[PDB]
């Protein structure tokens, strides 16, 4: 005697997982494939008649630094982080569209603002004592003084 | 002397039995842990009777040929 009433909540729980997986697998895969079609909206959305079947790109996982360089390199060729192209030669705009991130190198805010964490003998010296910065300013000044030789 | 505590250096076998009956959480945890280094000691046997160790992965960068640059190489010139 299998009690079917007791198995109903498990069926809904089973369908709970399937709702998440069915949406995530299809919505993400479709978006990656859609954005890999071209560099503008008229190619991503519209489907040409002379085009063949749609080949889908699945989501990526277990990546490393090479995949980050690949993703940026793909963007400079196709406008997508997972673009598709097997052309033996790139466009002319690929020679001058390199992206170079420039960022500050400042210490974390918690280091320089926490009421307790910002206090130490060397932090006070770096912040209130000019002994260190006087010496290092001499090195910078030598760079411009030595230009003439 | 029906249930005395065995002396380890006089009755090693009975000393093992006492702990395997009264302190199973100690006897068998050690027994499992001993199987680690014992298998590591059986490694030389495997290298001679089952199969040799694999060739090391090329994890030291690009393999540079141990030679001088070929000075007669041409092709795909400007």
């Amino acid at each position: 005697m299998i009690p079917f009433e007791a198995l109903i909540p498990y069926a809904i729980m089973f369908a709970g997982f399937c709702l998440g997986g069915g949406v995530m697998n299809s919505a993400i895969t479709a978006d990656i494939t859609k954005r890999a079609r071209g560099p503008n909206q008229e190619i991503k959305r519209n489907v040409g008649e002379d085009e063949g079947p749609r080949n889908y790109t699945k989501p990526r996982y277990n990546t490393d630094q090479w995949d980050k360089y690949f993703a940026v390199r793909d963007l400079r060729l196709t406008g997508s982080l997972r673009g598709q192209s097997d052309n033996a030669v790139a466009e002319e705009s690929f020679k001058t569209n390199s992206i170079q991130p420039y960022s500050n190198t400042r210490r974390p805010w918690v280091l320089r603002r926490h009421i307790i964490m910002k206090n130490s003998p060397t932090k006070w010296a770096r912040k209130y004592s000019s002994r260190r910065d006087e010496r290092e300013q001499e090195i910078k000044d030598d760079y411009i003084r030595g230009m003439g030789e | 002397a029906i249930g005395d505590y065995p002396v380890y250096y006089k009755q090693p076998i009975r000393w093992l039995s006492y702990h395997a009956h009264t302190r199973p959480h100690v006897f068998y945890a050690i027994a499992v842990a001993a199987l680690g280094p014992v298998f590591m000691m059986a490694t030389p046997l495997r290298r001679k009777f089952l199969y040799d160790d694999h060739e090391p992965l090329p994890a030291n960068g690009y393999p540079l040929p141990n030679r001088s640059r070929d000075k007669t190489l041409t092709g795909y010139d400007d």
Binding site: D31, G38, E91, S93, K140 | -
Partner: protein
């Protein structure tokens, strides 16, 4: 000689070569004093903080202000939002200003 300045992939990092040439100079037996290795020390410290190079950029920015040069006419173009690294900015033939996908690679 213990390893120093090891990159995140186990090999030498950007500034290891500068450090290695300092050690070789300081420990060479052909040197009477440590004066020959003074330029190598500055090069290693410049590799890490770039303090002199940042100082040069400070002078160029300041010198451009006093002559009225426009920062946006002499500098390099940049984008602050990653979503707007669009194909039009990248220069593609069929470029567009629509946002790029950065949600999931």
């Amino acid at each position: 000689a213990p390893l120093q300045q090891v990159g995140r992939h186990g090999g030498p990092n950007k500034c290891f070569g500068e450090f290695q040439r300092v050690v070789e100079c300081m420990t060479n037996a052909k040197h009477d004093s440590y004066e020959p290795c003074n330029n190598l020390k500055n090069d290693y410290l410049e590799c890490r903080k770039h303090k002199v190079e940042r100082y040069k950029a400070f002078l160029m920015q300041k010198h451009a202000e006093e002559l009225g040069k426009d920062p946006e006419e002499i500098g390099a173009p940049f984008v602050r939002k990653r979503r707007f690294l669009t194909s039009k900015t990248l220069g593609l033939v069929d470029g567009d200003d629509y946002e790029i996908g950065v949600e999931k690679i």
